[PDB]
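Quick one before lunch.
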Amino acid sequence: QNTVNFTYPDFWSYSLKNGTEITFLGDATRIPGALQLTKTDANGNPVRSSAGQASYSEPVFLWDSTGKAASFYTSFTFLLKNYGAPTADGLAFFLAPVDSSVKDYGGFLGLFRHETAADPSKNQVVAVEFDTWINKDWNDPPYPHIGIDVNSIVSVATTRWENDDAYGSSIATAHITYDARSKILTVLLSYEHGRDYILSHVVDLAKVLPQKVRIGFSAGVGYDEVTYILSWHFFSTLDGTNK
Amino acid sequence: QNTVNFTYPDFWSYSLKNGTEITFLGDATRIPGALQLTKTDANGNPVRSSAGQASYSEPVFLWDSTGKAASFYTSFTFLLKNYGAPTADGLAFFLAPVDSSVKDYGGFLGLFRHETAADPSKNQVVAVEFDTWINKDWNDPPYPHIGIDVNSIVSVATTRWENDDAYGSSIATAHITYDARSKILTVLLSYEHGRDYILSHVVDLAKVLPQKVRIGFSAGVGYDEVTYILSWHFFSTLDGTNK
Ligand SMILES: CO[C@@H]1O[C@H](CO)[C@@H](O[C@@H]2O[C@@H](C)[C@@H](O)[C@@H](O)[C@@H]2O)[C@H](O[C@@H]2O[C@H](CO)[C@H](O)[C@H](O)[C@H]2O[C@@H]2O[C@@H](C)[C@@H](O)[C@@H](O)[C@@H]2O)[C@H]1NC(C)=O
Ligand SMILES: CO[C@@H]1O[C@H](CO)[C@@H](O[C@@H]2O[C@@H](C)[C@@H](O)[C@@H](O)[C@@H]2O)[C@H](O[C@@H]2O[C@H](CO)[C@H](O)[C@H](O)[C@H]2O[C@@H]2O[C@@H](C)[C@@H](O)[C@@H](O)[C@@H]2O)[C@H]1NC(C)=O
Ligand SMILES: *[C@@H]1O[C@H](CO)[C@@H](O[C@@H]2O[C@H](CO)[C@@H](O)[C@H](O)[C@H]2NC(C)=O)[C@H](O[C@@H]2O[C@@H](C)[C@@H](O)[C@@H](O)[C@@H]2O)[C@H]1NC(C)=O
Ligand SMILES: *[C@@H]1O[C@H](CO)[C@@H](O[C@@H]2O[C@H](CO)[C@@H](O)[C@H](O)[C@H]2NC(C)=O)[C@H](O[C@@H]2O[C@@H](C)[C@@H](O)[C@@H](O)[C@@H]2O)[C@H]1NC(C)=O
Ligand SMILES: [Ca+2]
Ligand SMILES: [Ca+2]
Ligand SMILES: [Mn+2]
Ligand SMILES: [Mn+2]
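Model of the calcium ion complex:
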């Protein structure tokens, strides 16, 4: 088939082999109940300078020459665990080529190589980043932020993420949707007894990514921080693109 | 304050007086556990030709002359109960002037008056409609659909709603978000063991609605159908509009 539909309500079924449903790259590992993105020592304490990725194993169809394009929705809950405030560097949900791998740690979030990070012509990746560190040198806004990245670590759009939520270590729920007809990517982040965060931007995936992509989570540290993905749902539809 | 934040996890607290938290107009009524939008007989059986609205009682700030504009997110679960297939006419989440009231029933969904429904200059309303009836005469697409309505019942954009979901009578969860910086309205509709529906469109609320609006649910019937709203959450933020 050309569309994908999966739901993982939790990850307490930690015994699946690497690469069969989810592929782990770099320092990302499967633990009981979670996809862990960067490295921790014996006590679950975060290591500095680490990067990892957990991605769905199958390729995801996005578009083809015949006009058919996939609209999609993904939701996931995560626990960004902080051991002080501030922490570094964050996490990201991404869509990249099937053949790509984890790249640099720190503020590049395992998605970019330091040398070509601010160069759109040298990257093929769209990511929604949940940034905990202000990298002054790569144009981060002066606060923790949520951002949409298109072929570069310098986000095409961002919205403020409050300190209390960014460094509070509570489980958060994210909803990311893409409408393939109007080329709109929307991010919704919610905290159970807190506030919501909304960020939407026009981006034509067909114009920046290949026809088939790999989807997943990528993180880069940094220090005093580690991200655990607790559940994940992905659904894509070709609705309205003549199919 | 200029922003709104409320959460109703369920409506089993049916004893609040009309107009204090929620205002009921037309045939909409408060019942144990739900906001009922149109009329039913003794047995909960749907009446033909009815319209009703349940709206938040306080005015909601949307924008002002000084550039400040509200981004928002609302979520709600609803049960669109069907007594056969097809049914008519649907429901809608809307934003209208504080002083407006319920209008015609049938395909106008309590939001428009038959005479001026296809005339944008005569209406001030933005609505996300969940349309169960194909009104050939008002340009409905040839299937049940979800649509975004801007000052007219003829939607500026729509996406297919499958027959099985539109007439299946299962509880569905909706997420509607508006980003005031990029002027994007997104609708996400999810069924627990089913599919998701995504529809997003650029619409500048500041350009079509007054500075303060009333928000709520509106329905119009039709026949063999009745909608119950089971929970409702609304959150708005001025984030990124210099405030
Ligand atoms: C003078 O540069 C600073 O040098 C140290 C040692 O090389 C860097 O910090 C170490 O490596 C980081 C990746 C991170 O694991 C950190 O905990 C560790 O001490 C430092 O990098 C910046 O550290 C920040 C946290 O204090 C944060 O993680 C930033 O993302 C990180 O900057 C990124 O990574 C560095 C190595 C460069 O590639 C930068 O272009 C990039 O933004 C160094 N700071 C600077 C400004 O480079
Ligand atoms: C010839 O027109 C048809 O006449 C009947 C009686 O006046 C209309 O049906 C009744 O009223 C409806 C509002 C609804 O309560 C229905 O159950 C009831 O029998 C009929 O209206 C259309 O009925 C459809 C369901 O069979 C559906 O509800 C449509 O939304 C409704 O059309 C709307 O309402 C009518 C009254 C007009 O204002 C239309 O412009 C509008 O789309 C009439 N059909 C038509 C095509 O008008
Ligand atoms: C899970 O399976 C992957 C293969 O599909 C592993 O990645 C591959 O690991 C090789 C080194 O063992 C490396 O040469 C390959 O290029 C790499 N594949 C990609 C796309 O990068 C993966 O290995 C982890 O991630 C790689 C990038 C290295 O950092 C390894 O040290 C890691 O083990 C496997 N993960 C695990 C936990 O087994
Ligand atoms: C809940 O309180 C509302 C007042 O804030 C009622 O609406 C008002 O009802 C008057 C008739 O009793 C009418 O003249 C007013 O114009 C109307 N207000 C608006 C904004 O329309 C509301 O009444 C229901 O809805 C109105 C439109 C009529 O259809 C009434 O018959 C309904 O009772 C009150 N709802 C209930 C259930 O009490
Ligand atoms: Ca950063
Ligand atoms: Ca209709
Ligand atoms: Mn950033
Ligand atoms: Mn319609």
